[PDB]
């Protein structure tokens, strides 16, 4: 047929690394991350509140949400249900279709409009067309996708529960209040990932083993233009700063305009508060750049429509504007609402400046 | 404001007869029929299975369905929820907005996405903007509209329960299996209108007081092009034919192309069956036009996108084609499946022709 070419799922099978990076352990897990990303988008939309990830006895993986359920409604242009189109077409749901193409089999179940639908595929093709298999409970809506990556592409590879667990933990911190459940039905473990603290609880976890300046982390949230900003932080009693940055749920190891803006707005807000609170001293050493960040453990998580990167690092000057505005404003309020912490944090910055000035004087003695 | 003019609900109040025909008993009840028509369209779409019509103690009327519930989602163009737009704008839900404009007050409640929403209006204007008033039961979806026609427009008029009951009975026959409940909370009666027999049960009710040729009515259903065809019928032992015709749920008293096609297809199908069954005699009087319709009590109900009328009568040559194709085909099958009835029906037609031929001969004797 000419449709196999137009649907380009055969092209996914010939050139899989173009879609999943490779056919080793990482490419195998990108199939998982893609399915999860579709279930997560449903939580971000405000419909799904909990996600199940189940590693089955046969090595297959089930991803399920309690969202709206993939529309089963017949698309007029294609003359096929929306669920079928999304899983069989690259040129129209790209991610879902790549998983279908590269899996020996895929079963898509949809609980929608009081009905339980089921569609099955193998290597990109329909093996069972959409059909009502029964009634869904009165208030039950959602999607249940089960898939088995193709051994003709990946050989003897299998899912790694520690890699699944790491991603679910990250997602539970990036999407505050979303419950993600992991059931390993190959080894027998069952874990829950739920943190209403979000990026603030993530910042505290990043400080594990450290002496905390204060036990409860702070959370900054807000939107400026097309850029959505989320910041979690606390301080340790240490002198290093540790700032993890994310752009659209993926780690940005080389920072960018969101990191630069966070550091500037943070420093500006602390300086402004100290001035207004009378914490700053007239003479002596004044806390500069790094001084104002000592002991800071923070997580900066942004959402942008068209992000620009090298290779990593973020270039969007819009991201720099949005992080700046949201952080400066809310941090001023935090410091004001928690003057004991605010004073402890500024004192730390003052002591770093004092110790450097003391070290400079000791250098004269040589 | 300039919006009152653009929303044209003030224009409805100045010229109500342009929308509801008049400001007497009939115009007052057209407010009811319009709200019901919107709830009925939801049943036709396949979402609502039961409709409640409740005449309240205060003279207000509640219309409720178990459908999808009017979308509460914010329309981007207007920057207002869809429910608000539909009830406040003529130039974009025409019927709903006319009811709002001509009612002293209107309360629109929507059970959707696990939430119970409420919006209130008075004479076209919002008195209470859309707001979540509580949670809806897990599987509860639908719309509840309560309204009180404006005494500043209608004076001392009130709803007539017999007029409400007549419309609900008609709707229960035109929409086979739809349950419509009428609760008169002014007088104390409670009636149910549900008939899975549809237009066939309607045809039998039309024959009340008559001796039936057969007790169980027949139902013909089908679609040809843009025209949907529904026919219910039975025969009496009488010599008159009674054919009620409808186009898009409203009675067509002067018939049209749907009546013409029904009569032609019916006669053709009966003639064709008699030929094939060997019921027709070679010599003697052959049943003609009216002969083939004697004792026929039928209901012909069609659905068209652009119907053409005089003043009543239907002109659409498409309607004539669709009634013709659906009836001829299914009636041939009915006669074949019920040869005892088929033979009784044709015999009746033969006896009418025989009696006329006997009357012609008696005329020679003078």
From Swiss-Prot, chains A, B:
Region ATPase domain, residue ranges: 1-199
TM helices/strands, residue ranges: none
Cofactor note: Binds two Mg(2+) per subunit. The magnesium ions form salt bridges with both the protein and the DNA. Can also accept other divalent metal cations, such as Mn(2+) or Ca(2+).
Gene Ontology CC terms: chromosome; cytoplasm
Primary location recorded for the protein, binned into one broad class: cytoplasm
A GO molecular-function descriptor: metal ion binding
Additional free-text comment from the UniProt record: For the electron microscopy studies a GyrB-GyrA fusion protein was made with a Gly-Asp-Leu linker between the 2 subunits. It forms the expected dimer. Few gyrases are as efficient as E.coli at forming negative supercoils. Not all organisms have 2 type II topoisomerases; in organisms with a single type II topoisomerase this enzyme also has to decatenate newly replicated chromosomes.
Name of the featured protein: DNA gyrase subunit B
Organism of origin: Thermus thermophilus (strain ATCC 27634 / DSM 579 / HB8)
Gene (name only): gyrB
